[PDB]
Design an enzyme around this catalytic site. Structure first.
Site: not given
Ligand SMILES: *C(=O)N1C[C@H](NOS(=O)(=O)O)CC[C@H]1C(N)=O
Length: 271
Positions: A46, A49, A106, A142, A210-213
């Site tokens: 993520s 973004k 996100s 995505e 900005k997080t991601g996973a």
């Molecule tokens: C981003 O990496 N994603 C979007 C969503 N939010 O998680 S986040 O806050 O870690 O970005 C779910 C996890 C992930 C995805 N599966 O797209």
């Protein structure tokens, strides 16, 4: 030597959790930096973004697009983790609403809709090149881009390259003043990283992040720290190959936040 101590702390943290951890920190106040695996590739997930919103804002700055343009989209375009775009599908959303949804919440479909105005993943890659970033590449949309397979170059950045982008976008001249503020506001309004870098910061410090996973135990957090009494601090943190729960991964990133905040404080005190 605060930078050397921070790097040792990162190395120990990485080893005790069996992860591959990439970090770049650059304090604009002292101009000091520290890093770990700063030139290795990690999956953006993520975090792309942030760049997608930057590219849309830069287009708005130039008059190549408009934040007020209404984007229509269909039920067929909705992907997982789209809590804003899903309910608003029939009415559509403006580009500014989509930037906010992608950055603050996100929202995955919002990210895809931003990409659809930029020329897709190739356009995001071209945008990174224009920022002087020779490493980052987006290849998929995505949620395919979250696969995070070790060794796969697709959809990757490096901690140092992404920290450079954060500097240009939020603190440098890649955006005009109004757009720079909009992006900072969208990042500062996010809650998605409450248990990640932000959880490691001293009281009165703020982070616009900005997080991601993703797959393969991938969990990321990037942004700008505004300390209680200091100039801004760039931070990029990419974690991958975790065999632990999401909550355990988040706690590793919180500890990165503590390591970074201590280094910044030590530089400020002259420790
Ligand atoms: C981003 O990496 N994603 C979007 C969503 N939010 O998680 S986040 O806050 O870690 O970005 C779910 C996890 C992930 C995805 N599966 O797209």
């Amino acid at each position: 030597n605060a930078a050397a101590q921070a790097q040792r702390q990162l190395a120990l943290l990485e080893q005790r959790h069996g992860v591959r951890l990439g970090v770049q920190v650059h304090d604009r106040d002292s101009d000091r930096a520290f890093s770990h695996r700063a030139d290795e590739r990690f999956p953006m997930c993520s975090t792309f973004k942030l760049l997608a919103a930057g590219a849309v804002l830069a287009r708005a700055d130039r008059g190549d697009d408009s934040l007020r343009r209404l984007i229509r989209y269909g039920a067929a375009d909705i992907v997982a983790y789209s809590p804003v775009t899903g309910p608003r599908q029939a009415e559509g959303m403006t580009l500014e609403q989509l930037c906010e949804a992608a950055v603050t919440r996100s929202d995955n479909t919002a990210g895809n809709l931003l990409l659809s105005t930029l020329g897709g993943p190739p356009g995001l890659t071209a945008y990174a090149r224009g920022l002087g970033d020779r490493m980052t590449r987006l290849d998929r949309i995505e949620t395919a881009l979250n696969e995070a397979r070790p060794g796969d170059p697709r959809d990757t950045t490096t901690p140092a390259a992404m920290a450079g982008n954060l500097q240009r976008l939020l603190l440098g001249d890649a955006l005009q003043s109004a757009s720079r503020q909009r992006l900072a506001d969208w990042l500062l309004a996010s809650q998605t990283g409450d248990t990640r870098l932000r959880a490691g910061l001293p009281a009165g410090w703020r982070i616009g992040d900005k997080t991601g996973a993703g797959g393969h135990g991938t969990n990321n957090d990037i942004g700008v720290i505004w300390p209680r009494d200091g100039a801004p601090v760039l931070i990029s943190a990419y974690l991958t190959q975790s065999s632990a729960s999401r909550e355990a991964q988040n706690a590793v990133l919180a500890e990165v936040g503590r390591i970074a905040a201590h280094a910044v404080a030590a530089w400020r005190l002259g420790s």
